[PDB]
Design a protein around this ligand. Sequence first.
Ligand SMILES: COc1ccc2cc([C@H](C)C(=O)Oc3ccc(N(O)O)cc3)ccc2c1
Length: 295
Amino acid sequence: ASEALTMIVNLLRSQRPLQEPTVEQMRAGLEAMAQMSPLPADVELTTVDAGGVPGAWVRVPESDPDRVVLYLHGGGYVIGSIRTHRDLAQRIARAARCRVLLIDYRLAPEHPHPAAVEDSTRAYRWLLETGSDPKRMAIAGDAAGGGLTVATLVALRDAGVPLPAAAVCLSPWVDLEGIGESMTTKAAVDPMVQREPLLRMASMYLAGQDPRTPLAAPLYADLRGLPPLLIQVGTAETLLDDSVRLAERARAAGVQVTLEPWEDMIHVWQAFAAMLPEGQQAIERIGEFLRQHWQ
Ligand SMILES: COc1ccc2cc([C@H](C)C(=O)Oc3ccc(N(O)O)cc3)ccc2c1
């Protein structure tokens, strides 16, 4: 992998807190990290009320308004914001030549499961209400947001709502018990994501609910009828087998799944695309995948 990869890994390793951070710290820490990736001048951000869910359109000059990605940010269902993921959003908007709706969905522990799913489905329904065609739509998201993407599809389907053309999951989190093999074996090679912090955020999101609640942990959801699914995952991730198990399950349910394991990549490496080549390569692929399914 690139020298940029080894640099980011060592920097993350070196700056990892020596004790468990609070929700307040993680929130403000991610917000800070996020500000090191500045927003290019041609990016257009427009705040909007997505059917009672706050959000922002992210557009670049290339964008085709008729193509829309509903983007669901990661951060354990506990952290993240429009501002933490706007860079990733604009790269996708750029690569897929689309508009991206980045929503500030409700977060745990203030708003536990299923508040997140309530918001994502509402935002999706709002998109149809305002005239977006599912044939030119997609849902995408990273990690917790990658899990939320699957959950949202399942929920919409079960509600009889027309599903989008395609969907994309980046390092998705779908096992809230962390019993995948790579949680034990790949633990350490991932500078982020350890079991203990993971399960703590699971606890907050669940607020007592069964950790295999299907819409919370979509590894246990019924995936039949889902549209073409691109899953990008790094092979140095503790969440690798979240993607492996998701692909297995989705394909057994007749979903056209594409599992893309990027060698040596770390959790949501695409977030580092500003300086990580593979990050930008992966996003270019996202755009390619989406444009294929929109024609
Ligand atoms: C430099 O610009 C950025 C901007 C945002 C970032 C966001 C993330 C964050 C951790 C992210 O969205 O990924 C997740 C999502 C969910 C979890 N679980 O399961 O708790 C763990 C990581 C990481 C680097 C980032 C870098």
